[PDB]
Amino acid sequence: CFREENANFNKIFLPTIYSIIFLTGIVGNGLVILVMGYQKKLRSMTDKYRLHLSVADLLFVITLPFWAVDAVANWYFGNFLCKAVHVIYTVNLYSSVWILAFISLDRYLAIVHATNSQRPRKLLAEKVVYVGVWIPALLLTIPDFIFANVSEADDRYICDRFYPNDLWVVVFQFQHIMVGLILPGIVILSCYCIIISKLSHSGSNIFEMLRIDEGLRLKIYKDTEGYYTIGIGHLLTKSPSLNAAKSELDKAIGRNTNGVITKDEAEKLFNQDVDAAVRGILRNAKLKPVYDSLDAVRRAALINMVFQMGETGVAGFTNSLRMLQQKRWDEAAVNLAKSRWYNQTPNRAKRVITTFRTGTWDAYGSKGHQKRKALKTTVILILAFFACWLPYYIGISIDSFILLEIIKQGCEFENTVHKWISITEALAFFHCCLNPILYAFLGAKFKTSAQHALTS
Amino acid sequence: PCFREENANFNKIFLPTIYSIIFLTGIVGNGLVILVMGYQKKLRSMTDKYRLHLSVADLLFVITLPFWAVDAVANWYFGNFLCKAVHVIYTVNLYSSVWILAFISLDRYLAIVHATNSQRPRKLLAEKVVYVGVWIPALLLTIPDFIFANVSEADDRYICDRFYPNDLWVVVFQFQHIMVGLILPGIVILSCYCIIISKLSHSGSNIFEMLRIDEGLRLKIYKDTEGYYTIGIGHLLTKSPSLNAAKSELDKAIGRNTNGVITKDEAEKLFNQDVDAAVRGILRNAKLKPVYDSLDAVRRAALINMVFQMGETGVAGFTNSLRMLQQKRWDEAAVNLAKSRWYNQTPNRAKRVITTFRTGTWDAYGSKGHQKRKALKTTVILILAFFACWLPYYIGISIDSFILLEIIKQGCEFENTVHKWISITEALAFFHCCLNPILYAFLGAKFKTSAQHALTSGRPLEVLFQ
Ligand SMILES: CC1(C)CN2C(CS/C(=N\C3CCCCC3)NC3CCCCC3)=CSC2=N1
Ligand SMILES: CC1(C)CN2C(CS/C(=N\C3CCCCC3)NC3CCCCC3)=CSC2=N1
Ligand SMILES: CCCCCCCC/C=C\CCCCCCCC(=O)O
Ligand SMILES: CCCCCCCC/C=C\CCCCCCCC(=O)O
Ligand SMILES: CCCCCCCC/C=C\CCCCCCCC(=O)O
């Protein structure tokens, strides 16, 4: 049983993969570095980390021509570069994924503890990244530095890690699997496990919208003109007695409240109102046609207005409603800002109009537009990171099965495993291009066809 | 060829003896912890909550030591199932206890580093995350032992052990034991304590807490006697009669229909804006500007507090006192600040502020730091001793690692001597199980009674020498 490098495929396929990453990798990462680094000052936290990522990737990527030459012909470059390219490899595998781990910590802080997230998020991204990521990443390369050497072999020079015995191969494989994927994977998933759980105490989108706009009372309240209210703007009945109002709540809740209720029960009581509200809209001839043409988010917008102004009032916005039914969002946003509604209750009306305008929930929340895109960028990056690496992981797993005697096959099986590990690893280095590619076409509009080069 | 021979002369005598001792003192010690806290206790600290989990870990393992002793002295008489079970329980214990220690260190880190708001997260760690992140992983990681622990016939007896396909499996699992067992919990503990000792001297209070104490915290809108509407930490909203107009300003700022009520969290946000306005004005006031720049975090908090009390014009007027603070001569500046009208009028608050300018610590806004320091001392002792117990065994394993990895090349005799000292030291390392109970020994006791104090009522005038 001997090693057998294949000419037709690996000797040609790998250096090509290596060269393309090299090429697209210097340009893409080099652009991220100069574009944010040199020129552009005000930096977003995720962007701060993506600067780090692109530095880690350009460093690795500038060493790829060695890999390519090594694969096609020989290791002409001596012992010292041998250790150097190995070190540079380790540095990349560890820093890249942990920077990703740090992007997920940052998202956790942003979302889960948004109240005083700035002091710490800033601290993470400017002080802790060097001590948590870069320095350990370098310390951990001492092993590559020690055992990476060049040997003469079968008419060429191999640069590789050479150890006293086969146990050393298992020790460093286990460490690579641990520092590379299992520990950062634990942290990424844990952070996202905490995020999704924080997002589970909140109720429906329409409920959190109106809680913000109308307010949420957990205890009955007599106002100044004698009416009784609870939950999200829920009016109990005609009685002028706290007791008889408490009688009404008890009936709608199904329990002896004594004037206090829970959030969950307020959401249920609100759902019934939202329902009764939506029913009358579908009975109003002016409002129903618009409601039929709107997406859910924008229908929440119109329900909000009914919650505030009564069905009749809302039904008087004849020209704004008409632009909304026609999907003329900007016009309609513009027109609604000129009404007595806007001039009297701008805080509310501003959020509602932004909902109609965009068809998003950005107006609620702090910096909601920015936070929405930030969450999506992060998840895309990390999933794609692991997606690039996944076929290599499967390859390495199969090799592990050989060594640990989980499977027993001949050498022809073992040598096909090793060529596909060389292939899937090469294909994995595309991770170095994702960060730049996710920055492509920012602010582009895809609205031009061959006819639009010839006409309006 | 080197063969494994089991040692008797000392080892069939020494290990059962040590196992039996840890067995007896550990059952009594940990069982007491479990009964005395587990049930009676009503005011329990976080560290104590953790040391109950610890004593449960340790009792589970200690109760299985009789099997170890009989195994060492005679046989494995207990069949395949128990062979797996004593392993599982062994692995559960090695993992759970060291990680409980790591959680005791994360808890300490929150208690000292973030005392603006520790209580929710420390409560969460102690009652929920300890299960899902300590116990459950510990249990899941025993699946190997359950699978590979089996009973074998070897040299005139039954051998209970983990038997694998090949020697690479020995390596894969030992590295996991060292990692999960030592190097990951070690990293966590040492990182926590790196952050602590680096910040111990400037802890105890935030700028939020400082002013929350000097100025008070209002979750509800309050109208004072001169018509001013205020919220949170002295946040002025409006000064005209409508209350509803006050609400609308609060709503614009907070970004939601408050009805004049905000959370403690929104109050800190209003405050952090206000703090960024006062700093912005200080950096444009030429009288306050260069003094601010020369000051640490804590002493800047001390200036911003004054600006909130008596406004920017006022603080720009303590001309001599500020130069003193700028020169970094704290005591005379603190002597001088106590001679001002501000001090005679609001002495309590200004006493505190000056203490901050003088010493640069939050001592005036912080304590019950006599109990907190006793909490830190206990945790450091518990943890250091734990590692101290385990250290001779780590040295043995490291020696064994050198053999397999060919970092050294000695013969069979040398390997045999290492094998026996690893058994010795692991055995001794199990005293880790009695630390937790011992540390609770003698609470309330005073060591003042000599034989003479039993023969008499003491020596004359003991109260002079207390
Ligand atoms: C994990 C690792 C860094 C280790 N390694 C290896 C083993 S060394 C090596 N050459 C280079 C790998 C990359 C660093 C420089 C040496 N072998 C062969 C020799 C025959 C021709 C093809 C490559 C191949 S690809 C790979 N990736
Ligand atoms: C790490 C470990 C759990 C593994 N192990 C071992 C190896 S198994 C073993 N018997 C027992 C270990 C403890 C659990 C029950 C089996 N060996 C010998 C057999 C000959 C006489 C002395 C003990 C000894 S002490 C120890 N501790
Ligand atoms: C031959 C050894 C090669 C190893 C090189 C190791 C380089 C690590 C040193 C510094 C990491 C780069 C830090 C990037 C900072 C820019 C990002 C920013 O300022 O926001
Ligand atoms: C589809 C065609 C693929 C061909 C492989 C591409 C290889 C390009 C990458 C690196 C080329 C390096 C050339 C090595 C020089 C050594 C040759 C020699 O000196 O004899
Ligand atoms: C939580 C997920 C559980 C999966 C655990 C994965 C841990 C990895 C376990 C064993 C890896 C040991 C390395 C095997 C030797 C391979 C070396 C080689 O391919 O040359």
Torsion of CA A307, A309, A312, A316, to 10 degrees: -120
C-alpha separations of B66 from A183, B73, B87, B142 in Å: 37, 11, 14, 21
- Assign residue A221 the CATH number of its domain: 1.10.530.40
Q: Which residues contact A359 (CB under 8 A, 6 or more apart)?
A: A295, A297, A298, A329
Q: B106 and B221 in one domain? A: no
Which two structure tokens, joined as six digits, stand for A225?
């003109």
Half-sphere exposure of B209 (CA within 13 A, CB side): 16
Is the CB of B209 inside 8 Å of chain A's CB atoms?
Answer: no
Which domain does B436 fall in, by range? 1-206+367-466
Residue A447 belongs to a domain: no
Which two structure tokens, joined as six digits, stand for A328?
């003329």
CB atoms under 10 Å from CB of B287, counted, come to 15
C-alpha separations of B157 from B6, B17, B86 in Å: 12, 21, 19
Of B152, B159, B149, residue with least CA distance to B6: B159
How buried is B122 (Cβ within 10 angstroms: 0-12 exposed, 13-18 middle, 19+ buried)? buried
Q: A95 and A20 in one domain? A: yes
Q: A258 and A196 in one domain? A: no
Which two structure tokens, joined as six digits, stand for A268?
């249920």
Strand (E) positions, B303-359?
A: none
Technique used: X-ray
Residue A168 belongs to a domain: yes
Find the angle CA(B372)-CA(B373)-CA(B376) to the nearest 5 degrees.
90
Residue A389 belongs to a domain: yes
Give the atom of ligand 2 at the shortest distance from the alpha carbon of B91: 3
The answer to whether B231 touches B268, Cβ cutoff 8 Å, is: no
Pocket-testing residue among A165, A182, A400, A420, ligand 5, by greatest number of atoms within 8 A of Cβ: A400
Give the atom of ligand 1 at the shortest distance from the alpha carbon of A82: 15
Q: A408 and A310 in one domain? A: no
DSSP B427-447: HHHTTHHHHHHHHTTTTT---
Characterize the bridge pairing of strands B218-223 and B158-162. unpaired
Domain finish residue from A305, A335, A366: A366
Which two structure tokens, joined as six digits, stand for A330?
């900007």
- Assign residue B373 the CATH number of its domain: 1.20.1070.10
Beta bridge pairs of residue B153: B158
Of A240, A239, A238, A234, residue with least CA distance to A252: A234
Kindly state the helix (H) or strand (E) to which residue B56 belongs, with its residue range. helix B46-62
Is the CB of A264 inside 8 Å of chain B's CB atoms?
Answer: no
Identify the residue whose C-alpha is closest to ligand 4 atom 12. A69
Q: Does B168 sit within 8 Å of A116, measured CB to CB?
A: no
φ, ψ for residue B232 (rounded to 5)? 55, -130
Number of H helices, E strands in chain B: 24, 5
C-alpha separations of B8 from A401, B151, B156, B307, B411 in Å: 39, 21, 14, 79, 21
Q: Does B166 sit within 8 Å of A170, measured CB to CB?
A: no
Q: What secondary structure letter does DSSP report for B161?
A: E
Q: Order of strands across the sheet with B218-223? A: B218-223, B229-232, B235-238
Is the CB of A13 inside 8 Å of chain B's CB atoms?
Answer: no
The whole-angstrom distance between residue A349's C-alpha and the CA centroid of its chain comes to: 30
- 3-state DSSP call for residue B409? coil
Is the CB of B168 inside 8 Å of chain A's CB atoms?
Answer: yes
Characterize the bridge pairing of strands A217-222 and A228-231. antiparallel
Of A266, A105, A112, residue with least CA distance to A200: A112
C-alpha separations of B460 from A149, B449, B452, B466 in Å: 80, 15, 12, 12
Which two structure tokens, joined as six digits, stand for B324?
């003193």
Is the CB of B162 inside 8 Å of chain A's CB atoms?
Answer: no
> How many structural domains is chain B composed of?
2
Q: B173 and B137 in one domain? A: yes
φ, ψ for residue B159 (rounded to 5)? -110, 120
Beta bridge pairs of residue A231: A217
Q: The tokens 């962007």 sit on which residue? A: A47
Q: Which residues contact A451 (CB under 8 A, 6 or more apart)?
A: none
Q: A197 and A72 in one domain? A: yes
Q: Which of B257, B266, B271, B405 to mutate to test the interface with A (most CBs of A within 10 A)?
A: B257
Cα(A401) to ligand 5 centroid in Å equals 9
CA distance B381 to A414: 53
Which two structure tokens, joined as six digits, stand for A345?
């209750």
Which string of b and e fits A198-230 if b means at least 16 CB within 10 Å?
Answer: eeeeebeebbbbbbbbbbbbeebeeeeeeebbb
Of A173, A179, A37, residue with least CA distance to A95: A179
CA distance B325 to B292: 9
Which string of b and e fits B146-161 if b means at least 16 CB within 10 Å?
Answer: eebbebeeeeeebbbe
Which two structure tokens, joined as six digits, stand for B380?
């450091």
Kindly state the helix (H) or strand (E) to which residue B91 belongs, with its residue range. helix B79-113
CA distance A181 to A175: 10
Cα(A17) to ligand 4 centroid in Å equals 12
**Direct distance between the N- and C-terminal alpha carbons of chain A, in angstroms, rounded to an integer:** 69
Measured from the alpha carbon of residue B148, the closest ligand is 2
Chain A hits for B270, Cβ within 8 Å: none
CB atoms under 10 Å from CB of B336, counted, come to 18
CA distance A162 to chain B (A): 13
Which two structure tokens, joined as six digits, stand for A420?
């596909």
User: For chains A and B, what is the number of CB pairs under 8 angstroms?
Assistant: 58
Find the angle CA(A336)-CA(A339)-CA(A340) to the nearest 5 degrees.
140
CA distance A235 to chain B (A): 16
Q: B396 and B284 in one domain? A: no
Domain finish residue from B366, B395, B420: B366
